[PDB]
Amino acid sequence: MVEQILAEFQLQEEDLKKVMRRMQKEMDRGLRLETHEEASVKMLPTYVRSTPEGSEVGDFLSLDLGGTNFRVMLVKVGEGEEGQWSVKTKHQMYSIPEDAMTGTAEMLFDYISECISDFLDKHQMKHKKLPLGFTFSFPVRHEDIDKGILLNWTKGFKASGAEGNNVVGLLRDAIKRRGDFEMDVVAMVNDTVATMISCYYEDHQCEVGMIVGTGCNACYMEEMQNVELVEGDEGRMCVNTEWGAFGDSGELDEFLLEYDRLVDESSANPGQQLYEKLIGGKYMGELVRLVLLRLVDENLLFHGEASEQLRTRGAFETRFVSQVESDTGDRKQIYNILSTLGLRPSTTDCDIVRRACESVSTRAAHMCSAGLAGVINRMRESRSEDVMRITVGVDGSVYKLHPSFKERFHASVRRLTPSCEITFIESEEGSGRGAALVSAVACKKA
Ligand SMILES: CS(=O)(=O)c1ccc(Oc2cc3nc(-c4ccccn4)[nH]c3cc2CN2C(=O)CCC2=O)cc1
Ligand SMILES: OC[C@H]1O[C@H](O)[C@H](O)[C@@H](O)[C@@H]1O
Ligand code: NA
């Protein structure tokens, strides 16, 4: 029975409360000196602090590295009503070559600095020496707002000899070893951090950032006294939970399915990022693919016959998941996806594939809701407030564009967060505006 195979994806409320409590426990472990180093949830102080210690105005360069495409953009920051407006003015996107991303650090950052030029020249501006904000969507141990070493690549990145190294250095070398231009690199932030920062003008309650895109992560404003790895008890600092690695010490073992185990084993980073592998768009289409393969090996789908493409890793794209679940019921979208994959599905084949899609994506919404509710309830407790009103800034294609993910996600987080009133804001150019606003504050020292 297909329903019996799909039922393995369900999570009961008690399963979610369990996931939630365990996440809260790992978050606490990551923050404490005695456990931070062994912690699966690393809880990385980011050096982004509360209060407006003045902001510079003008134009800022923003880099965005964290997918196969790299982005360079210009953001103009200025003074006003609530404070500082920000707006992307010029933007250019760049694909990284196959052998550039598998090259070396020094090399990849050369392709990156090269790309900064194709943008600088192509916009009448190689002569400018701009402040630079770098959104870099990989786990970094910060020493400061402008200094921090990459702990490891995630999401299938692999450039050699980049791990263990100050990432801002690597970038300032490619800037020297280019002669071309001069840029001052003032801040490196995680994408979660940028997204939250980008909503803060519109909403001063925005103190969490969450990405549900290719990967899955969040950050939030922690009490400085709770942040044991930075001296000081005063104010708040932003903590990059890196919750993607929740489960890398076995915390999700009772939930993982044969599909999860296979995605993990054939991944670039086996044994790591296990929570993220349940949720992120890098993995969601692959999960459905494996579920489809299981259904077929059992003769419950495509009369037990799978195409060449269907048996290939990566072929069931995450965007297909989202398109399958947008089908209006006439099966046209489903049929056209499958047919392109060299399949000839029946009416019941289409409906099964839809069901497989719903199961994978519902489980990602719910699994993700437990992570966030854990963050929100911790913060409600830390701040000692009765009804906590909080805004979460959110970005990522899974959340923004999968037709039912956001609604299932919001319903499930609200269920797990009594006495919290959560406002969700989808960020508008969160990466670039976010890196720009941090930059503009980091430009009060210099
Ligand atoms: C004027 S305004 O009110 O429109 C306005 C003000 C700030 C804005 O972004 C920020 C930039 C920052 N740069 C640093 C930094 C940088 C270096 C060292 C230490 N700190 N910290 C920052 C905090 C924020 C805002 N911030 C919070 O305070 C809680 C959640 C959040 O996003 C956005 C709009
Ligand atoms: O892009 C979302 C997330 O992807 C992975 O989880 C990265 O390790 C993390 O830094 C990033 O925030
Ligand atoms: Na502290």
Quick one: CATH architecture of 1-45+202-428? 3-Layer(aba) Sandwich (3.40)
Catalytic choice (191, 248, 264, 327): 191
Write out the two tokens for 33: 């000196």
Residue 130 DSSP one-character state: -
Domain 46-201+429-441, CATH: 3.30.420.40
The H helix count followed by the E strand count for the chain is 14, 13
Our answer to whether residue 351 is catalytic in this structure is no
How remote is the CA of residue 106 from the centroid of ligand 3, in Å? 34
CA distances from 169 to 144, 148, 150 (A): 13, 9, 11
Using an 8 Å Cβ cutoff, are 167 and 188 in contact?
A: yes
- In ligand 1, which atom is closest to the CA atom of 201? 4
Write out the two tokens for 20: 């939630």
Q: Which ligand is nearest to the CA of 216?
A: 2
Q: Which residue type is seen at 140?
A: V
Residues linked to residue 141 through DSSP beta bridges, in sequence order: 149
Pairing status of strand 131-136 against strand 140-144: unpaired
The reply to whether 423 sits in an annotated binding site is no
Indicate if ligand 1 lies below 6 Å from the C-beta of 85.
Answer: no
* Strand residue runs (E) in 162-205: 184-189
How remote is the CA of residue 31 from the centroid of ligand 2, in Å? 18
The reply to whether 301 sits in an annotated binding site is no
Pairing status of strand 147-150 against strand 140-144: antiparallel
Indicate if ligand 2 lies below 6 Å from the C-beta of 371.
Answer: no
Domain ranges of the chain: 1-45+202-428, 46-201+429-441
Indicate if ligand 2 lies below 6 Å from the C-beta of 209.
Answer: no
Q: Which of 40, 48, 134, 137 to mutate to test the pocket of ligand 2 (most atoms within 8 A of CB)?
A: 137
Write out the two tokens for 90: 């010029």
How remote is the CA of residue 245 from the centroid of ligand 1, in Å? 27
Q: For ligand 2, atom 11, which residue shows the shortest CA distance? A: 137
The DSSP-derived string for 83-95 is: S-EEEEEEEEEEE
Indicate if ligand 1 lies below 6 Å from the C-beta of 197.
Answer: yes
Lookup result for tokens 């090996």 = 297
The reply to whether 28 sits in an annotated binding site is no
Q: Which of 68, 150, 188, 191 to mutate to test the pocket of ligand 2 (most atoms within 8 A of CB)?
A: 191
Our answer to whether residue 155 is catalytic in this structure is yes
Q: Which among 393, 396, 385 has a CA at the least distance from the CA of 207?
A: 393
Could you tell me how many residues make up the chain?
A: 446
Using an 8 Å Cβ cutoff, are 73 and 92 in contact?
A: yes
The DSSP-derived string for 246-313 is: TTTTSTTTTT--HHHHHHHHTSSSTTS-TTGGGT-TTTHHHHHHHHHHHHHHTTSSGGG---TTTTST
- Please report, to the nearest 10 degrees, the dihedral formed by the alpha carbons of residues 102, 105, 108, 110 taken in order: -150
> Cα angle at 350 between 349 and 352, to 5 degrees?
65
Indicate if ligand 1 lies below 6 Å from the C-beta of 27.
Answer: no
